[PDB]
C-alpha cells in the first residue's frame, strides 16, 4: 500500500502510531510535541486507525501523568502509545518500570533530546534513552525518516505480540524535523500485519470486573524474588518476534532490516558501531572511502534492548580487528558509555579473540557529526589509536578530542544539488522551501531532503535552510557545508554573518539587495565577500525583490522563482500551478518579473585584489560560529555572566518610535510599558548636559532636565509605548529606522552615562520606579511580549537583593538563551541571582533558596550574638540583629558592619566579616508561566506556598503553553482554541488564585499592567513586604493569542481584559482580609474575545459552538466575579507517648528503635467495654 | 473538528525558535516589528 | 572522640549527616523515614551540627520536591543532605542530573529498596541505586552499621572538597534496621576533618545577588557539547579525594 | 483492583477511563454497523440508546449475551467477542490524605478538571498513616505528628474547596460515624 | 576506578563472580558485572572467567 509523502520523523512516526493505537496520552515536550499535535489533528478530522476508529488522544498535566495514563489504558486493555523526549522520559522511567513489570504491551515513541545537566537543551543526543535501559522496555532505533516509519511499525507489531512494551527512538531535531521523501504503507496493509490471536489475548488478560484480578500488590522478602524472576520467558521470546516482524514488514515495503545491520567492506578491519542518525552519515562516508579501496564498515544497532549478541556477532565481520563504539551520551565517571559496555560484555561473554574496542563521544546536544569527523574516527582507528575520545569539539580541559580535517571533499553522491537559504525570521523562506520540497517531490523522481536551522531569538532571528535534491537517496544527515547554490534573503546579513562559507566553485550566489548597481555594490559589499565572489569565479545574481514586490502590489515568490530557475534541479510551470492551487494574478506577475530580473552581475576584476567576554565568546556565538569555541571558554558548572544583552545592538525593527518633546507630559508610562527596555528616562542636571531635554516637573524634579531617550537599535518596533502615550497629539510617533537611527544612536551612547536618579522619588510610585535602573534589559522575547515588562518592573523594585527561581517556559528562554543574558548588574554590581532548575521544580528550588538563606542568616545571628560579648561594632551588630527582618535597616547596618569589619579575618569578628553577602535581607522570587503554576510544577508551588515561609511567586499567566507551540493549559479558558483544544476548550480556567486563597495565610493578588500600573506597584511592594507566602498572577499577552491589531495593543488588550471582567483584579491580605480593586464587568467580553485570533478562528470554524462557548464564558466570568463581590462585601515530643492504646502497627513500614513497647492493640474492645466485661465477670 | 488558532491572522502566532517549528509553519507574516496596524496606517498616510 | 552506642544504620547515618549538614529537605519513604524523623527530633531538641547550629529540616510534598529543595539549598550555598529510598530515588534522578551538572556538593543517603515492577516492595536490593549511575553522582557503599557511619562521614567530607555530589547507600532493612554496637566519633572530631578552604570557596561561588551569575541557561547545538565536557577535571579529582579522606 | 504508584493513581484511573471509553465507542460503532434478526436489532438498539445507564446497559448486555452465544463470525462475532464491555463500568480512585493532598495532587487535579466521568474517594486520615504517621497537608493546625513535633502551624489543605472552584465537579464531604444516610 | 580495583584483585585469581542485587530485563548483564568486564577489557591483559549472579532481591535472604 506504499504511497510517497514528503515529511519529517514526527509525521512518519505519528502516521504509524495513529494506525496502530487506539489510546494516546501525551504531554507536550520539544521535539516530540509535533507527533502528539498531529495525532490530535487527525483525531479531530476523523482519521481512522487500523481498527476503524479515531484515535483517542488526551493531554496530561505532566509526562509522569502521560506514563500513568498509558499504564491505565494498557491495564484496562487498550492499545496505547505516547510520545516523549528527554525530561519527559526522565519523568516517565518509574512508571516504565511498572509497565514492563506487568508485561503490558505499550509503545513509547521517544525523540532523542539532551538531559539538562549544566544547561537546559532541546537538541539531540541519547542521554534520555540511555537513562531508561533498566526499565525493561525493548528499545528500537531508527536512522532516517524511512527507518522511523518502518521501525515504528515493527515496534507496534512486536509490542502487540510479545507482551513486552517497546520504546522506539529516533534522533531529535535531526530526524524529527528533517523533511525527506519517503514511502509509507496504507493502513490496510499495516492492519494485516497484526497478530490477532495475541491482540485478543491481550484484551482478555486486562483489568475488568467481569474477570477480576489484583494487580500491584505489596510483597515481602519471601516471594518478591520469584515474582521478579517469573517474567523471563517473555524477554527470551521478544527478539525473535522483532526479527520475524522485520521480515514481515520487509516483505511489504521491500527494505530489509535486522537487529544489527552491517554496511561496508565484508573484509573490513576498522568497524564503527553506532546507533541513530549518525549511522546514515557514516554510511555515506563509507560509500566514499570504499571507492578508494578502504577496508572500513559499520554496524548499525536497531534493537538496543534486549541486546542480542547472536545478531551482533552475525553482523560483525570476523576480519574486523579494531572497533570504535560511538555513543551520543556522557556519563561522568562511568568506565564507559552504555553501548560500549554492551559491546564489551558481548566480547567478554563470547570468550574468543577480543579485538581492540574504542569508545568515543560525538554529537552531544545535536552537535554536528560531519563526514570529516567520521573520517577522523576511522583515521584514529587506522593509526595512533585513542580510547575514550570526543569527536567534534576542541577539548583542552582534559585532552579528549580527535583532530578533524575540515577539507573532506564532497561525499554526498554525485547527482545531488545542495542549497543554502539564509533568511530573516517570518520572511517566508522556510515556508517557501517546504513548498519547494513538496512540489519537487510530488512532481519528480528526485529525493528531497530539507533541514531548517533556527535561532534562539524569537523576533528578528536568522533562519538557515539546507536543501538537498538527489537522484540517489539522501543519506547526508548533517548541515550543508559545501553548497551548490547560496541565497541570501536579507542583505543585512551580508555584513553580520558569513554567507559564503559554504559556497563551492562557481556556485550560484543569489542576493537580495536594494542596491542593484555596480557602484552601490562596490560601496556596500564587504571586501571579504567581494574577494570571494571574484576569486572562485562565482555566478553572482543580485536582485532587489522588495521593489518588485512593491510594484506588483512579501518577497516569498521572487525568492522561490530565483530558486526554481537557478538551482538546476528542474519549475516555472510547477510554481505557477502551485500558486494557482493556493491575488493569483499578482503572484504570477511577481513570478514573471522576477524571471526577467535575474541576470548575472558583471563584477569588477579588481574585486579579486580588493566586555572582553563579549569579544571572545559572545560575538562568535551570535555570529553562529561558536563551534570553534574550545572547552576552555565555558565554565565547568555552566554558569553565565550577567549583562550580555547590552552589547547585542540588533536593529531589526522596521519602525522605531520618535519622541516629540513638546507634547510630552513626563508621565513615565512608555518606560513602564516597554517590553525590551528601549525607553530610557534620562533625568539630568543642566551642568551635566541634538539631545533635546525638557524641564522636569514637580518638587522632587526641581533643577533637573527631563528627557526620554529611545534605544533605536535595541527597539523591537512593537508600538506599545506610542499606543500608551497619553497626549492626544502623540509624544511618540513610529518612524522608519533608517531615518531615525543615525541621529539617535549617539544620543543613547551619550545618555548611557548620566547617573540614574533613584533617591528623588520612591520606588513604589510609577514615575519613581521608572527612575530606577532596570536589571532585565533587551530580552529575546517576542516583539510586544506581555511577560518582560512585569519582570523588568519587579527587578526595578527589587533587583539589588533578589533570588529568581525561574521555571521552564518563555521566561527561561528569553531570560537566558546562551550567550545572551538580559539580566544585568547595577552600578554597585548587585544584580538578580537568577537560576532555572526544571519545569516542575522551580518552586522547590526557590523554597530551598529560602531555607539556605534562613540557615545562613541564623548562623550569622548566632555569631553576632556571640560577638556582642569595640562599642561601635556592638552598636552596629545590635542594630543589625534587631532589624535583620527589615531590608532597609538590614541594608543600613550591613553597610555599617562592612565598614567597621574591613580586613577582619580573625575570630568571631573575622567570621562575621567573612559572610558580608548575608547582611541585607534577600528576596527570593519564583518566576514561571501558566504551565508551571497550573499544570506540572503545581504541587511544588502549592507546597512551598502553604509551608508558611517568606517566598513570593509571580505567575506570568499567558493562558497557554506559550513556549512550546501554544498547547492547551489549565489556564486556557473556556471556548479557547489551542493545541489539544482544536474544537474549543470545554473546561474553564484553572482557578489557581482562588485555590491558594483558601489557605488564609497567603497574600494573593491579581494584577494587569495595561489596566492600572499603580495596583501592580502596590501589589509588588506589599507582596514582598508580607511575612509569609505570597502569590501574584499577572495577565500577560503572547503572540499566540493572535492579537488582530498587533502586539502594540497588549496594554490596551490588558486594559480591556480587566474592564470586561475576564481578568478581575483583587487582593487577599491576611494581615475583611479580601478586597476587590477591580470594577464590575462592562459587558464588553464579546468584543475582547473577538479581538483575539483564537476566538476568531473558533468562530470561522464552528459558529454555533463558538457562540455557545462565548455565552458560557461570559456567564461564568459573571458568576465568578459575583462570588468575588459576595466575599468582598464583608521542642520535641512524639504523638505516641503516654497513650493507653497503640499509635503504631507492627508492620516494617512503622518500625523505629524507640518503638516496640507493649501496648493494647484494640483487640479486646474499647476501654469502657473492657471495664464492663471485667465488672460482669 | 480541527482548526488551528494561527490561520488567517494578520500577525504571526508563532516565533522562529526551534521549540515552535512544524511542517505547516513558515509562511511569511508580519512579526510586530513595524508597529501596530493602526500605527502602520498612520505612517503610510503621513508618508 | 569515639563513643560507643547501639543503633541501626538509620541512626548511624543520621548522626553523621546531622553533624555535616545545615539544610535537609526530606520526604518520608520506608526504610529511609527514620533518618529524617530522628534528624527532625534532634533539631527540635536542639542538637548542633559541626558549625554549632541546629540543622534546618523541612518536609516536601514529594521526593522530587526534596531533590529540588536540595538543589536550591546547594545553589544558595548551604551544606545540604537528603535521605532517600527506591521510589524516592527514581523521582529524584532528573534533579540529580542538574545537581551533578552544576557541580554542587550534596550528599544523598539512600537506603537500598526494591523498585516496584511486578509488585510494590519496601525491602532491600540495589535496583534504585543502579538506576542512578548516569546522574553523575559519586556513589559510596557501606556493608555494616559501623561502615555506614564511617562512609557517611567520608561522603560528606569528600563532597565538600570535591564539588561533586555524593550518594551514600547502605542496604535497606538489612543495615537500616539491624541494631549493632558501634563506636561513633564526637562532633568535635569530625568537625576538624572539614576542608575549610573548600567550604569557604563553596559558599563563595553560590547564587547570591551581591555577586550574581546566570545558572540554568538554554543552549543550542553550538556550545552544549563544550559545556558538557568542561566538568571533567572535578571527576578526575574526586577518587583521590575519597581515598585521602578514607 | 490495581495499584500503580503513590503519585499517579489518578492518572492510572483516568487512563482506565480512556481505555473503557475507546473500547465501548468501538463497540457502539460495531453495533451501529450490525443494525444494517429483529430481536438482535432490538437488543442492539436498546443497548446503544442506554449504554450510559448502568441499569439499562446491564439489562440489554444480558440480552445480547443471551442472543449472541457462540457467535464467532462477522460483525456479530466481533460484537459477541467483547461481552465484558456491555454494562457501563465505574472507575474509582482510592487513596489517602498524602496522595490526594501532597504528591499525587497534580494528577488528581488534572483528572478531576478534565471533565471525564471519574470518581475519586479520599480516605483523609489527616496524616501519612501508612508511613509512620508523618505530617501531611491534611494534618490540621496544632496537630503533633512527625515533622510537626511542636504542633503543626499550617492548616488543613482545603482540598474540597480547591476542587469546588471548578464548578463542573461533584464535591461532597462525608463521615460515616455521623450519618450513614448522607 | 580500575586502578583501585586491580590493586585489590589478586593476580592469582582465575575465576570471578560479580554478585548483583538487581534485575535488568534483557541487559547483557547487571551494572557491576558490566563495570568489571569493562575494567578487564580496558586492561587488555589476561582475562579471568567472569560470572554474574543475582541474589537477595527484595531483601531476600543471602
Ligand atoms: C517535565 C517537562 N515537560 C515538558 C517540558 C517542555 N516545556 C518547556 S516550557 C513548557 C511550557 C511552559 O508553560 P508556561 O508555564 O505556561 O509558560 P509560558 O507559556 O509563559 O512559556 C513545556 C511543556 C519540560 N521542560 N519539562
Ligand atoms: C514517591 C513516593 N514517595 C514515598 C512513598 C512512601 N509512601 C507510601 S504510602 C505513603 C503515605 C501515604 O499517605 P496517605 O495518602 O495519607 O495514606 P494513608 O495515611 O491513608 O496511609 C508514603 C509516603 C512512595 N510509595 N512513593
Ligand atoms: S508616555 Fe508619552 S507623555 Fe508619557 S513620558 Fe513617555 S513620551 Fe512623555
Ligand atoms: S514599546 Fe515597543 S516600539 Fe516602543 S521602544 Fe519598546 S519595543 Fe520599541
Ligand atoms: S510569552 Fe508569548 S509573546 Fe512572550 S516571548 Fe513567549 S511566545 Fe513571545
Ligand atoms: Ca512574602
Ligand atoms: Mg504560558
Ligand atoms: Mg493518610
Amino acid at each position: 500500500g506504499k504511497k510517497m509523502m514528503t515529511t519529517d520523523g514526527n509525521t512518519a512516526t505519528a502516521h504509524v502510531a495513529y494506525a496502530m493505537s487506539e489510546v494516546a496520552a501525551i504531554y507536550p515536550i520539544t521535539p516530540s510535541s509535533t507527533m502528539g499535535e498531529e495525532a490530535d489533528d487527525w483525531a479531530a478530522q476523523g482519521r481512522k486507525n487500523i481498527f476503524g476508529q479515531t484515535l483517542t488522544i488526551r493531554e496530561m498535566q505532566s509526562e509522569a501523568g502521560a506514563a500513568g495514563a498509558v499504564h491505565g489504558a494498557l491495564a484496562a486493555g487498550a492499545l496505547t502509545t505516547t510520545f516523549t523526549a528527554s525530561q519527559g522520559l526522565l519523568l516517565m522511567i518509574p512508571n516504565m518500570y511498572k509497565i514492563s513489570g506487568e508485561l503490558l504491551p505499550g509503545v513509547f515513541h521517544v525523540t532523542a533530546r539532551a538531559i539538562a545537566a549544566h544547561a537546559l537543551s532541546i537538541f539531540g543526543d541519547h542521554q534520555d534513552i540511555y537513562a531508561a535501559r533498566q526499565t525493561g522496555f525493548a528499545m528500537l532505533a531508527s536512522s532516517s525518516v524511512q527507518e522511523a516509519h518502518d521501525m515504528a511499525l515493527v515496534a507496534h507489531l512486536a509490542a502487540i505480540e510479545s507482551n513486552v512494551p517497546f520504546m522506539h527512538f529516533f534522533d531529535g531535531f535531526r530526524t524529527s524535523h528533517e523533511i525527506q521523501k519517503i514511502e509509507v504503507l496504507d493502513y490496510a496493509d499495516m492492519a494485516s500485519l497484526v497478530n490477532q490471536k495475541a491482540l485478543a489475548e491481550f484484551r482478555a488478560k486486562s483489568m475488568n470486573p467481569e474477570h477480576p484480578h489484583v494487580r500491584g500488590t505489596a510483597q515481602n522478602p519471601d516471594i518478591y524474588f520469584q515474582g521478579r524472576e517469573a517474567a523471563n520467558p517473555y524477554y527470551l521470546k521478544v527478539p525473535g518476534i522483532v526479527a520475524e516482524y522485520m521480515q514481515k514488514v520487509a516483505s511489504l515495503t521491500g527494505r530489509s532490516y535486522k537487529l544489527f545491520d552491517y554496511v561496508g567492506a565484508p573484509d573490513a578491519e576498522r568497524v564503527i558501531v553506532s546507533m541513530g542518525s549518525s549511522c546514515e552519515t557514516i554510511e555515506e562516508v563509507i560509500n566514499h572511502l570504499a571507492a578508494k579501496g578502504e577496508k572500513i564498515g559499520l554496524i548499525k544497532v536497531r534493537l538496543y534492548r534486549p541486546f542480542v549478541s547472536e545478531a551482533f556477532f552475525a553482523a560483525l565481520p570476523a576480519s574486523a580487528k579494531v572497533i570504535t563504539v560511538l555513543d551520543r551520551t556522557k556519563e561522568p565517571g562511568a568506565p564507559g558509555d552504555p553501548l560500549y559496555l554492551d559491546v564489551c560484555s558481548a566480547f567478554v561473554e563470547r570468550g574468543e579473540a577480543m579485538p581492540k574496542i574504542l569508545a568515543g563521544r560525538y554529537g552531544l546536544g545535536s552537535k554536528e557529526f560531519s563526514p570529516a569527523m567520521v573520517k577522523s574516527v576511522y583515521d584514529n582507528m587506522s593509526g595512533a589509536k585513542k580510547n575514550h575520545f570526543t569527536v567534534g569539539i576542541e577539548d583542552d580541559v582534559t585532552g579528549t578530542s580527535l583532530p578533524v580535517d575540515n577539507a573532506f571533499a564532497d561525499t554526498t553522491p554525485k547527482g545531488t544539488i545542495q542549497c543554502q537559504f539564509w533568511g530573516l525570521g517570518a520572511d517566508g523562506t522556510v515556508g517557501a522551501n517546504k513548498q519547494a520540497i513538496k512540489i519537487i517531490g510530488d512532481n519528480t523522481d528526485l529525493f528531497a531532503q530539507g533541514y531548517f536551522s533556527y535561532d534562539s531569538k524569537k523576533s528578528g532571528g536568522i533562519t538557515i535552510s539546507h536543501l538537498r535534491f538527489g537522484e540517489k537517496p539522501i543519506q547526508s544527515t548533517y548541515l550543508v557545508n559545501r553548497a551548490d547554490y547560496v541565497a541570501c534573503h536579507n542583505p543585512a546579513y551580508v555584513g553580520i554573518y558569513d554567507i559564503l562559507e559554504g559556497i563551492k566553485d562557481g556556485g550560484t550566489f543569489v542576493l537580495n539587495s536594494p542596491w542593484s548597481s555596480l557602484e552601490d555594490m562596490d560601496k556596500h559589499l564587504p571586501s571579504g565577500i567581494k574577494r570571494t565572489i571574484a576569486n572562485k569565479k562565482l555566478k553572482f545574481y543580485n536582485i532587489d525583490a522588495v521593489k518588485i514586490a512593491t510594484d506588483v502590489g512579501r518577497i516569498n515568490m521572487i525568492m522561490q522563482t530565483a530558486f526554481f530557475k537557478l538551482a538546476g534541479v528542474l519549475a516555472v510551470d510547477l510554481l505557477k500551478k502551485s500558486i494557482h492551487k493556493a491575488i493569483v494574478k499578482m503572484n504570477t506577475d511577481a513570478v514573471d518579473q522576477a524571471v526577467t530580473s535575474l541576470q548575472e552581475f558583471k563584477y569588477p576584476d579588481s574585486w579579486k585584489d580588493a566586555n572582553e567576554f563579549f569579544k571572545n565568546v559572545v560575538k562568535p556565538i551570535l555570529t553562529q560560529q561558536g563551534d570553534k569555541l574550545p572547552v576552555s571558554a565555558f565554565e565547568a558548572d555552566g554558569r553565565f555572566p550577567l549583562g550580555t544583552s547590552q552589547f547585542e545592538k540588533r536593529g531589526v525593527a522596521i519602525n522605531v518610535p520618535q519622541w516629540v518633546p513638546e507634547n510630552c507630559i513626563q508621565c513615565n508610562q512608555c518606560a513602564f510599558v516597554c517590553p525590551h527596555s528601549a525607553i530610557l528616562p534620562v533625568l539630568a542636571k543642566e551642568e551635566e548636559l541634538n539631545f533635546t531635554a525638557l524641564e522636569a516637573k514637580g518638587k522632587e524634579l526641581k533643577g533637573y532636565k527631563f528627557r526620554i531617550q529611545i534605544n533605536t537599535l535595541d527597539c523591537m518596533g512593537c508600538g506599545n509605548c506610542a499606543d500608551i502615550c497619553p497626549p492626544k497629539e502623540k509624544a511618540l510617533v513610529m518612524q522608519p529606522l533608517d531615518t531615525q537611527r543615525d541621529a539617535q544612536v549617539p544620543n543613547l551612547e551619550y545618555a548611557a552615562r548620566i547617573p540614574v536618579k533613584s533617591e528623588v522619588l520612591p520606588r513604589d510610585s510609577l514615575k519613581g520606579s521608572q527612575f530606577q535602573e532596570p536589571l532585565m534589559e533587551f530580552s529575546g522575547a517576542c516583539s510586544g511580549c506581555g511577560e518582560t515588562p512585569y519582570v523588568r518592573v519587579i527587578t526595578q523594585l527589587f533587583g539589588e537583593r533578589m533570588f529568581i527561581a525561574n521555571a521552564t517556559g518563555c521566561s527561561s528562554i528569553w531570560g537566558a538563551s546562551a550567550p545572551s543574558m538580559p539580566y544585568k548588574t547595577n552600578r554597585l554590581g548587585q544584580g538578580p541571582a537568577w537560576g532555572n532548575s526544571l519545569f516542575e521544580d522551580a518552586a522547590e528550588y526557590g523554597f530551598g533558596m529560602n531555607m539556605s538563606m534562613f540557615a545562613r542568616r541564623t548562623h550569622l545571628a548566632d555569631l553576632a550574638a556571640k560577638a556582642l560579648e569595640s562599642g561601635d561594632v556592638k552598636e552596629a551588630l545590635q542594630g543589625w540583629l534587631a532589624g535583620k527582618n527589615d531590608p532597609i535597616k538590614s541594608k543600613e547596618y550591613g553597610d555599617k558592619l562592612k565598614k567597621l569589619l574591613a580586613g577582619q579575618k580573625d575570630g568571631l569578628l573575622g567570621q562575621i566579616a567573612a559572610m558580608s553577602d548575608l547582611y541585607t535581607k534577600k528576596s527570593v522570587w519564583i518566576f514561571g508561566g501558566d504551565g508551571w503554576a497550573y499544570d506540572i510544577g503545581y504541587g511544588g508551588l502549592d507546597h512551598v506556598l502553604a509551608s508558611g515561609e517568606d517566598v513570593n511567586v509571580f505567575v506570568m499567566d499567558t493562558e497557554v503553553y506559550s513556549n512550546t507551540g501554544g498547547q492547551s493549559s489549565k489556564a486556557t479558558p473556556t471556548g479557547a482554541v489551542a493545541k489539544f483544544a482544536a474544537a474549543g476548550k470545554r473546561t474553564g480556567k484553572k482557578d489557581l488564585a482562588r485555590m491558594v486563597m483558601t489557605y488564609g495565610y497567603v497574600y494573593v493578588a491579581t494584577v494587569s499592567m495595561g489596566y492600572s500600573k499603580q495596583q501592580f506597584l502596590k501589589v509588588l511592594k506589599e507582596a514582598e513586604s508580607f511575612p509569609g507566602p505570597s502569590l501574584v498572577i499577572a495577565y500577560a499577552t503572547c503572540i499566540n493569542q493572535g492579537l488582530r491589531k498587533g502586539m502594540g495593543k497588549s496594554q490596551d488588550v490588558m486594559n480591556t481584559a480587566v474592564k470586561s471582567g475576564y481578568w478581575p483584579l483583587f487582593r487577599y491580605d491576611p494581615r475583611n482580609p479580601f478586597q476587590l480593586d477591580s470594577k464590575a464587568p462592562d459587558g464588553s467580553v464579546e468584543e475582547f474575545l473577538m479581538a483575539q485570533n483564537r476566538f476568531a478562528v473558533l468562530d470561522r470554524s464552528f459558529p454555533e459552538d463558538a457562540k455557545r462557548l462565548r455565552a458560557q464564558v461570559a456567564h461564568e466570568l459573571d458568576v465568578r466575579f459575583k462570588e468575588l463581590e459576595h466575599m468582598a462585601a464583608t521542642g520535641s515530643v512524639d504523638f505516641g507517648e503516654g497513650a493507653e492504646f497503640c499509635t503504631r502497627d507492627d508492620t516494617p513500614m512503622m518500625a523505629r528503635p524507640d518503638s516496640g513497647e507493649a501496648c493494647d492493640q484494640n483487640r479486646a474492645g474499647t476501654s469502657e467495654q473492657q471495664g464492663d466485661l471485667s465488672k460482669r465477670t
Side-chain angles (χ1 to χ4, degrees), chain A residues 523-584:
Chain A
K523 192 181 177 310
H524 287 93
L525 230 49
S527 195
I529 309 212
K530 298 185 302 187
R531 288 191 316 269
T532 59
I533 299 178
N535 279 334
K536 55 187 63 177
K537 189 62 193 313
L538 284 211
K539 280 85 143 171
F540 181 19
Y541 298 32
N542 189 326
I543 61 180
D544 40 359
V546 202
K547 180 185 71 61
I548 285 174
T550 311
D551 162 87
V552 310
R554 314 303 192 181
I555 42 174
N556 331 138
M557 298 301 166
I558 290 86
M559 299 320 180
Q560 199 141 11
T561 311
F563 169 60
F564 273 110
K565 291 294 284 185
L566 305 174
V569 319
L570 280 151
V572 213
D573 215 68
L574 303 178
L575 177 50
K576 281 202 179 87
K577 292 210 287 307
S578 85
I579 294 177
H580 283 53
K581 296 306 170 64
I583 289 180
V584 173

Side-chain angles (χ1 to χ4, degrees), chain A residues 950-952 1023-1030:
Chain A
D950 204 328
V951 90
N952 320 315
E1024 192 265 344
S1025 167
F1026 174 47
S1030 179

Side-chain angles (χ1 to χ4, degrees), chain A residues 734-760:
Chain A
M734 303 299 300
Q735 217 64 55
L737 166 77
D738 182 67
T739 54
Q740 226 206 291
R741 52 159 291 195
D742 307 73
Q744 286 293 342
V745 169
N747 283 22
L748 168 87
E749 147 73 0
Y750 174 77
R753 324 177 223 177
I754 296 287
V756 185
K757 312 301 175 305
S758 55
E759 289 89 340
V760 307

Side-chain angles (χ1 to χ4, degrees), chain A residues 45-325:
Chain A
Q45 300 166 32
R47 190 189 294 261
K48 302 293 176 171
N49 53 36
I50 63 176
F51 313 118
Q53 264 72 48
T54 73
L55 200 137
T56 298
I57 287 112
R58 293 294 182 263
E59 174 209 346
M60 301 312 296
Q61 87 291 326
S62 165
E63 272 109 2
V70 161
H71 192 193
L74 288 173
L79 285 179
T80 315
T81 197
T82 194
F83 309 100
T84 322
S86 63
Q87 270 301 326
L89 207 58
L90 286 196
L91 273 328
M92 284 192 190
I93 273 137
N95 244 316
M96 302 170 55
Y97 265 108
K98 275 283 187 176
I99 291 180
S100 76
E102 310 182 359
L103 302 165
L104 292 176
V107 193
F108 293 9
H109 301 275
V110 175
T111 330
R113 170 180 173 261
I115 303 293
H118 73 290
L120 207 74
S121 189
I122 62 163
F123 289 85
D125 54 67
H126 295 160
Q127 286 167 205
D128 51 348
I129 71 107
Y130 283 140
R133 309 165 275 170
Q134 318 256 123
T135 54
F137 269 51
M139 298 181 59
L140 211 59
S142 15
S143 282
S144 53
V145 187
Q146 191 71 89
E147 299 208 21
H149 167 275
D150 295 326
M151 291 285 102
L153 187 51
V154 173
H156 277 272
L157 303 175
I160 293 179
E161 189 183 22
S162 54
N163 274 129
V164 172
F166 268 68
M167 179 198 303
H168 169 235
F169 60 101
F170 44 103
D171 279 300
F173 287 115
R174 192 55 257 189
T175 293
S176 202
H177 288 66
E178 156 208 24
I179 286 292
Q180 202 135 2
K181 179 185 181 173
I182 72 153
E183 44 166 9
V184 310
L185 287 169
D186 236 8
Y187 279 11
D189 288 65
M190 31 185 54
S192 67
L193 295 177
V194 173
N195 196 337
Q196 308 286 353
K197 170 183 160 173
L199 178 69
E201 209 269 274
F202 157 71
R203 300 213 190 280
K205 80 168 159 76
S206 62
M207 292 180 68
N208 197 270
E210 274 81 307
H211 44 265
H213 56 269
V214 175
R215 77 153 73 259
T217 63
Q219 306 193 9
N220 281 30
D222 183 53
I223 68 164
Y224 189 76
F225 202 164
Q226 287 106 344
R228 210 72 195 80
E229 285 296 287
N232 303 9
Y234 298 74
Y235 283 94
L236 294 195
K237 285 206 298 304
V238 52
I241 287 151
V242 176
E244 92 185 14
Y245 268 134
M246 279 171 160
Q247 270 88 280
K248 293 184 186 284
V249 174
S251 67
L252 263 61
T253 76
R255 311 172 288 268
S256 299
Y257 306 89
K258 306 172 193 179
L259 278 46
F260 299 83
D261 280 291
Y262 182 73
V263 153
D267 47 2
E269 312 99 16
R270 314 194 294 281
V271 170
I272 293 173
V273 171
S274 202
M275 182 158 60
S277 53
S278 150
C279 300
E280 282 299 289
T281 300
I282 304 170
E283 187 167 349
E284 176 201 347
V285 183
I286 298 167
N287 295 328
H288 191 85
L289 301 202
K292 300 161 65 73
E294 280 254 23
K295 302 299 158 60
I296 55 148
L298 159 75
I299 293 175
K300 308 190 274 186
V301 178
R302 273 70 147 99
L303 190 70
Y304 179 67
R305 284 292 190 262
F307 194 83
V308 174
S309 290
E310 193 269 351
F312 172 73
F313 286 134
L316 182 96
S319 176
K321 64 187 189 194
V322 52
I323 303 160
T324 47
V325 185

Side-chain angles (χ1 to χ4, degrees), chain A residues 435-490:
Chain A
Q435 296 315 288
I437 290 173
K438 198 162 294 173
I439 284 158
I440 291 166
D442 276 328
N443 300 135
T444 22
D445 52 2
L446 279 71
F447 290 92
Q449 181 201 90
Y451 191 66
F452 305 130
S453 313
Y454 297 141
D455 182 21
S456 245
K457 293 294 193 183
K458 288 170 172 291
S459 248
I462 185 189
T463 303
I464 319 175
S465 289
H466 319 246
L467 302 202
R468 298 174 163 99
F469 302 89
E471 171 73 31
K472 295 308 180 178
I474 304 292
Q475 303 189 50
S476 301
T477 310
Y478 58 97
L479 316 167
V480 172
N481 301 101
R482 275 97 192 285
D484 267 322
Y485 164 91
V486 187
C488 196
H489 290 200
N490 190 338

Side-chain angles (χ1 to χ4, degrees), chain A residues 113 119-122 456 458 776 779-781 785 787-788 791 804-818 820-823 834-839 842 927-929 932 956 963-964:
Chain A
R113 170 180 173 261
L120 207 74
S121 189
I122 62 163
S456 245
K458 288 170 172 291
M776 201 290 293
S779 289
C785 168
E787 285 188 332
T788 40
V791 292
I804 307 181
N806 201 275
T808 307
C810 275
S811 338
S812 70
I813 299 304
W814 50 251
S817 298
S820 81
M821 308 295 135
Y823 294 89
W834 189 87
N836 168 39
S837 164
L838 302 165
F839 191 9
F927 290 171
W932 157 80
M956 282 159 274
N963 186 25
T964 48

Side-chain angles (χ1 to χ4, degrees), chain A residues 968-970 972-978 980-989 1098 1101-1110 1112-1113 1116:
Chain A
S968 176
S969 152
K970 294 191 57 182
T972 312
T974 304
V977 169
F980 317 130
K985 174 166 190 281
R986 307 305 165 112
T987 63
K989 181 259 308 174
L1098 170 71
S1101 47
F1102 298 105
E1104 46 277 7
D1105 288 326
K1107 75 175 298 286
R1108 212 179 281 90
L1109 297 173
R1110 275 184 297 206
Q1112 306 303 148
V1113 173
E1116 77 160 322

